[PDB]
Amino acid sequence: ATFEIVNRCSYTVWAAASKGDAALDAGGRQLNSGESWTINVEPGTKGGKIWARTDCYFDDSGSGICKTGDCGGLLRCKRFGRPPTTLAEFSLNQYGKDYIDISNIKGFNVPMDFSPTTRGCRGVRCAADIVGQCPAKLKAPGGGCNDACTVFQTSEYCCTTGKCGPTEYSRFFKRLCPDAFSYVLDKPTTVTCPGSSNYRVTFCPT
């Protein structure tokens, strides 16, 4: 499948694409404001994620640090990034269907639209000013708005027992972005698309 990743933010972001144990395509790239990066994702990819990283510094060899979403200090991400990260999540060609969603379960750093570029389903968006409205205890110094599990490490926020409810913190994310997962057991906002659809991820869509 083809993903076009577009930075509509006024600031540079470092896109990242990983399935947790391996890079997707190159795994990461600098996107200046307005730049587009087209990647190819193998059919059948299960549990892929795309996110933006902010305020990165990398050397010649592609090693460095980002203030949000850092994936072990590499430009080319092989593993998932450090919260807070707004997440575009997808599983492709799962019994004939693609499944896509946006998640705030690992916090929020950059607003995001995740839409098909082919027919047969709708896109999802989380474009509210979550960082500006972020509750004081969830604000990340590097920027962004952490989820409550990352901050407090309790069974309830992390849903470690498989039973957990919404919380004051999850309801904040849900109020600003109803179409994104706000906690592990949230009523799913997953979109079902035809198998082998193509997609565009737009940072700062508005």
* Residue boundaries of the structural domains of the chain: 1-206
DSSP state of 75: S
Query: Determination method here?
Result: X-ray
Give, in words, the CATH class of 1-206: mainly beta
198: exposed, middle or buried (C-beta count within 10 Å: 0-12, 13-18, 19+)? middle
Contact predicate 133/175, CB 8 Å: no
Burial readout 65-102 (b: 16 or more C-beta within 10 A, e: otherwise): ebbbbbbeebbbbbbbbbbbbbbbbbbbbeeeebbbbb
For β-strands 191-194 and 97-103, DSSP reports them as antiparallel
Contact predicate 90/39, CB 8 Å: no
